[PDB]
Amino acid sequence: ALRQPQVAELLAEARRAFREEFGAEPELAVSAPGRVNLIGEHTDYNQGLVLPMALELMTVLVGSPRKDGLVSLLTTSEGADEPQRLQFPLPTAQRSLEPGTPRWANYVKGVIQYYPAAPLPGFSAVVVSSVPLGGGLSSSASLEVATYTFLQQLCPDSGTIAARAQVCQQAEHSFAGMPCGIMDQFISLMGQKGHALLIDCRSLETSLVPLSDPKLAVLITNSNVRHSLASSEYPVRRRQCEEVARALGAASLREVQLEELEAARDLVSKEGFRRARHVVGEIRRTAQAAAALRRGDYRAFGRLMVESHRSLRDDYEVSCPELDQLVEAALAVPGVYGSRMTGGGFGGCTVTLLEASAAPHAMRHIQEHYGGTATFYLSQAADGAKVLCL
Numbered sequence: 001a002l003r004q005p006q007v008a009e010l011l012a013e014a015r016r017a018f019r020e021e022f023g024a025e026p027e028l029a030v031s032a033p034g035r036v037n038l039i040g041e042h043t044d045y046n047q048g049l050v051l052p053m054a055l056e057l058m059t060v061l062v063g064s065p066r067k068d069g070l071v072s073l074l075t076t077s078e079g080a081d082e083p084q085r086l087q088f089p090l091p092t093a094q095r096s097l098e099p100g101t102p103r104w105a106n107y108v109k110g111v112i113q114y115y116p117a118a119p120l121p122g123f124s125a126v127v128v129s130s131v132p133l134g135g136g137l138s139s140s141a142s143l144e145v146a147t148y149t150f151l152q153q154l155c156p157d158s159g160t161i162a163a164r165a166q167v168c169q170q171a172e173h174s175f176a177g178m179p180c181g182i183m184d185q186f187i188s189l190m191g192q193k194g195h196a197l198l199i200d201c202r203s204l205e206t207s208l209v210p211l212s213d214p215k216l217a218v219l220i221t222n223s224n225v226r227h228s229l230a231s232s233e234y235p236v237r238r239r240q241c242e243e244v245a246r247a248l249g250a251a252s253l254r255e256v257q258l259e260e261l262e263a264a265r266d267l268v269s270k271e272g273f274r275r276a277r278h279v280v281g282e283i284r285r286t287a288q289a290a291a292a293l294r295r296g297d298y299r300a301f302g303r304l305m306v307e308s309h310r311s312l313r314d315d316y317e318v319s320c321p322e323l324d325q326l327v328e329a330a331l332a333v334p335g336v337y338g339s340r341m342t343g344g345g346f347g348g349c350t351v352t353l354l355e356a357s358a359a360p361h362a363m364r365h366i367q368e369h370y371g372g373t374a375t376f377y378l379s380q381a382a383d384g385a386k387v388l389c390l
């Protein structure tokens with residue numbers, strides 16, 4: 001059985017908690033979703049192509065401006081580290097915000113710190129989410145983009161959608177010590193109901209690709225494991241990629257194709273060569289997968305998904321036995337087109353494209369084959385960041 005999601009239920013929860021917490025009805029509501037990457041993994045920081053969609057799993061901030069220049073936060077999200085409440089003054093020229101405890105508030109502090117428009121007033125907010133915290137569906141990008149979307153109501157920015165992704169990304173880098181690409185923040189902002197989003201991470205061109213055929217489902221399976229390497233080995237992959245680009249005199253691996261890589265094998269470590277083969281291959285597969293998805297060629301799409309996983313398992317070596325066993329189980333189920341790890345790896349989630357009617361059978365079979373305890377979301381493509389005046 002798939003874990004259910006909510007929206008107005010989250011707003012009502014947010015709202016009740018805020019009224020209890022601050023003695024007044026909140027003035028403002030925002031939402032930003034988590035994401036699944038359908039294909040195009042470890043390409044965003046390589047100026048590659050990614051094809052994410054926004055989930056119905058989302059973060060909701062409910063708040064009001066203050067006159068006293070301080071920020072007061074409650075989260076009801078479980079899994080959030082103690083305390084559930086934090087207050088801090090706004091940063092100034094003299095005194096910047098600092099990352100620390102509790103860690104959940106670092107995402108909000110980071111976005112406030114890098115917010116490009118003045119004057120930013122203080123505010124009171126309640127934070128809720130259905131995005132499982134650090135389960136591999138970009139809970140942190142959902143919190144950053146919801147925060148960003150809230151600040152825009154306190155003090156409108158004059159900029160682009162990418163500029164806002166970059167701020168949220170700077171918060172992730174500087175306040176959470178995770179040097180991510182733009183994919184997660186970009187999809188949280190840019191998502192549309194019934195669409196995946198093709199992101200060119202070189203040009204920052206985006207295209208909404210239809211994905212709401214009722215005979216098709218996206219099954220997210222959470223391994224409910226996260227090896228420490230998810231955190232430590234992510235920045236290592238970015239450096240090895242930079243090292244290969246650098247060796248080949250390329251601005252980025254986007255500029256490099258397997259032929260040029262094959263010819264500069266002497267110029268690069270055995271592992272360097274493996275990381276680049278995945279990225280160069282993964283960029284190709286993502287363009288092929290976009291072309292496939294448009295035609296409604298799910299069989300081809302699924303094949304490209306399996307190739308992405310094999311590449312991530314063997315060349316990028318960012319899978320783990322848990323994810324591999326989850327992908328093995330999925331590909332054994334009749335009506336499954338394809339399965340792969342999604343996001344950073346070393347745990348988190350798999351994404352499976354399958355005929356809707358196969359989902360019940362696939363969930364039973366994945367669970368019985370999974371040596372741990374799997375969690376399931378059946379995900380339609382959802383809207384990106386929204387605002388509701390209360």
Ligand SMILES: O=C1CCCC2=C1C1(CCCCC1)N=C(Nc1nc3ccccc3o1)N2
Pocket residue numbers: 059075077079080081103104127128129133134139140143
């Ligand atoms: O420990 C890690 C390791 C790296 C991945 C990651 C975490 C934690 C950090 C804060 C405490 C819980 C776990 N949280 C997130 N994301 C997040 N999204 C949130 C939305 C609403 C409220 C709180 C939220 O925390 N990501």
Ligand SMILES: OC[C@H]1O[C@@H](O)[C@H](O)[C@@H](O)[C@H]1O
Pocket residue numbers: 037040041042043044045180181182183184343344345
């Ligand atoms: O495709 C791998 C992805 O890993 C995520 O953890 C990261 O936040 C994204 O920016 C992207 O690099």
